[PDB]
Amino acid sequence: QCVKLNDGHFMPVLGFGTYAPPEVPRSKALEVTKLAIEAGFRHIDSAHLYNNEEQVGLAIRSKIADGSVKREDIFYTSKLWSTFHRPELVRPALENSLKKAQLDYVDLYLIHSPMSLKPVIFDIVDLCTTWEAMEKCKDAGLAKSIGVSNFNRRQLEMILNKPGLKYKPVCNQVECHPYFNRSKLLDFCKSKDIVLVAYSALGSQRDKRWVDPNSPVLLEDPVLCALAKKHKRTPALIALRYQLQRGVVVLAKSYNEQRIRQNVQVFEFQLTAEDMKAIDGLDRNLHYFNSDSFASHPNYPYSDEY
Numbered sequence: 001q002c003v004k005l006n007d008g009h010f011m012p013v014l015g016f017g018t019y020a021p022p023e024v025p026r027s028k029a030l031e032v033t034k035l036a037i038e039a040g041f042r043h044i045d046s047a048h049l050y051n052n053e054e055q056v057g058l059a060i061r062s063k064i065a066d067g068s069v070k071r072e073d074i075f076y077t078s079k080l081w082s083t084f085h086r087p088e089l090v091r092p093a094l095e096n097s098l099k100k101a102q103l104d105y106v107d108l109y110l111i112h113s114p115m116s117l118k119p120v121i122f123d124i125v126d127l128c129t130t131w132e133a134m135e136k137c138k139d140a141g142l143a144k145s146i147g148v149s150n151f152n153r154r155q156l157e158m159i160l161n162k163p164g165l166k167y168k169p170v171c172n173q174v175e176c177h178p179y180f181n182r183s184k185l186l187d188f189c190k191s192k193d194i195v196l197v198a199y200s201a202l203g204s205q206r207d208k209r210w211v212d213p214n215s216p217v218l219l220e221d222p223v224l225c226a227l228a229k230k231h232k233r234t235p236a237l238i239a240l241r242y243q244l245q246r247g248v249v250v251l252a253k254s255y256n257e258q259r260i261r262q263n264v265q266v267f268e269f270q271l272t273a274e275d276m277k278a279i280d281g282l283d284r285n286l287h288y289f290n291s292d293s294f295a296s297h298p299n300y301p302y303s304d305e306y
């Protein structure tokens with residue numbers, strides 16, 4: 001299934017998460033993205049930060065080349081890293097990601113984060129100027145659609161109320177799972193025809209660089225475990241399926257062949273209303289990404305949200 005974005009284009013509601021840390025070789029990003037497409041994933045999420053666009057773009061091109069999919073059947077996202085918020089740096093950053101991926105266009109380009117950094121050392125940029133330059137990339141045909149990531153409600157409103165806005169963001173990609181379900185923001189987005197896309201929807205990869213290993217492991221949650229057994233699925237599948245029934249597009253990273261195939265099972269069953277309330281009962285404001293390196297930053301998004 002696919003959801004119609006607010007600029008007319010379509011986005012598959014299940015997305016492949018492509019991040020893997022440095023300890024993993026760049027060549028597994030190629031292998032696993034091919035397997036993902038083979039299992040039925042049509043939405044692939046990447047970014048400049050992830051240092052894998054060559055591999056991921058080659059995986060897409062390899063599956064166009066063997067006739068398994070057509071380019072228009074694939075929805076590929078890249079993101080504008082935070083060192084490149086100044087407007088004159090926006091289009092070059094995008095032309096860069098395209099050259100790396102060896103594609104003619106991304107389906108989606110995002111501002112990766114509102115926390116601007118110098119081209120831990122901070123920058124001040126007017127994000128409306130960055131956005132105008134995002135609009136120009138849509139007009140040029142470089143990005144079929146454009147959107148934001150890690151924006152809170154006030155930071156989104158700044159764009160939507162901009163004088164002479166040409167394009168609403170089509171989406172906001174934010175951390176979103178049963179421990180941090182972003183309900184209030186979700187309602188805001190729905191009221192504006194903006195799609196919430198969930199990352200770390202399986203509880204994040206627990207990278208010691210950003211995540212407190214003392215954090216509860218979402219996929220070992222007792223209520224999700226009980227629901228997995230009721231339905232004879234896995235706690236991963238309950239957490240993904242939770243997101244689809246709330247109108248959220250969900251990403252899922254996995255570099256394991258069995259779990260990549262398992263995750264597409266999310267289309268094969270449904271949770272009931274009481275199942276959904278039980279999962280709603282788990283919200284506890286736990287953002288796994290919780291670092292000094294973001295938290296003292298003038299435009300920290302989790303600064304609002306009280």
Ligand SMILES: NC(=O)c1ccc[n+]([C@@H]2O[C@H](COP(=O)([O-])OP(=O)(O)OC[C@H]3O[C@@H](n4cnc5c(N)ncnc54)[C@H](OP(=O)(O)O)[C@@H]3O)[C@@H](O)[C@H]2O)c1
Nearest residue numbers: 017018019045199200201202203204236252253254255256
């Ligand atoms: N915009 C941003 O700021 C931002 C931030 C975070 C993530 N993202 C994007 O969203 C994507 C996904 O988020 P994430 O990387 O934090 O990981 P995630 O989807 O939350 O996955 C976390 C771990 O779950 C595992 N997993 C996958 N399927 C499973 C299953 N069926 N059963 C048990 N575990 C399973 C994976 O381990 P294995 O690989 O061993 O299977 C993965 O490392 C990222 O890859 C990236 O594309 C964006």
Ligand SMILES: O=C(N1CCOCC1)N1CCN(c2ccc(Cl)cc2)CC1
Nearest residue numbers: 019047049113150205207289294301302
């Ligand atoms: O996409 C990112 N990945 C990919 C998922 O695994 C590691 C880091 N990052 C690092 C964490 N990032 C972040 C930025 C703002 C907030 Cl509020 C939370 C996390 C920026 C993007």
